């Protein structure tokens with residue numbers, strides 16, 4: 193019967209890894225589609241178009257990408273195109289943002305000619321609510337691809353991944369840089385490191401942090417500090433910026449849990 197539990201455990205752990213991999217593929221595909229959409233905006237924005245055409249392109253970009261909460265454009269040679277667009281409930285609000293290029297991070301993207309990424313942060317939206325997310329920056333180029341003429345900044349809403357992570361389920365965690373919880377069913381965990389939340393189980397947490405750094409995947413067990421019951425745990429990393437080459441392209445991670453007692457209670 194000890195061998196019964198062992199074969200139950202193996203079966204459960206494998207199915208968790210299968211379920212988690214499909215979930216990672218779902219989240220990656222959301223990101224990849226947004227990146228593809230950004231790539232098309234990046235090409236179209238520097239062409240000779242009306243200012244209103246550019247604005248409406250950025251609005252439609254937001255409308256077509258449910259996980260984007262805002263977008264900005266900056267042009268070196270044009271003060272009239274230093275604009276930020278943010279979701280404003282049913283509409284999209286336009287705002288002037290003249291210092292948009294005068295920060296060290298925007299300059300980084302434009303000097304490097306490469307995709308750049310911020311760390312997760314809370315952005316104040318037009319209605320005064322805060323949205324947790326990350327900025328992705330791409331340099332805007334001239335048609336001859338040798339001169340950078342500006343920058344596109346895309347605010348990806350981490351909170352909008354509730355659709356994949358917390359909608360009608362509470363067994364998933366989205367984890368980011370150095371073990372920060374980006375999204376989980378328990379809202380109070382957001383922006384806190386797993387090293388703090390799960391300090392009661394340092395062996396399991398250090399193992400998760402090592403997998404996060406090394407870009408791997410694994411299963412393990414741990415005593416959950418909220419339920420006080422042992423859980424099965426599967427984790428899997430993926431490159432947050434995808435195949436795109438950049439020093440800012442680090443691993444995100446999705447974690448899936450199952451309470452051990454519930455597996456064994458079924459037998």
Ligand SMILES: c1ccc2[nH]ccc2c1
Pocket residue numbers: 365386390393396397398400414425447
């Ligand atoms: C360490 C231990 C348990 C955990 N559950 C989710 C992340 C995580 C890290």
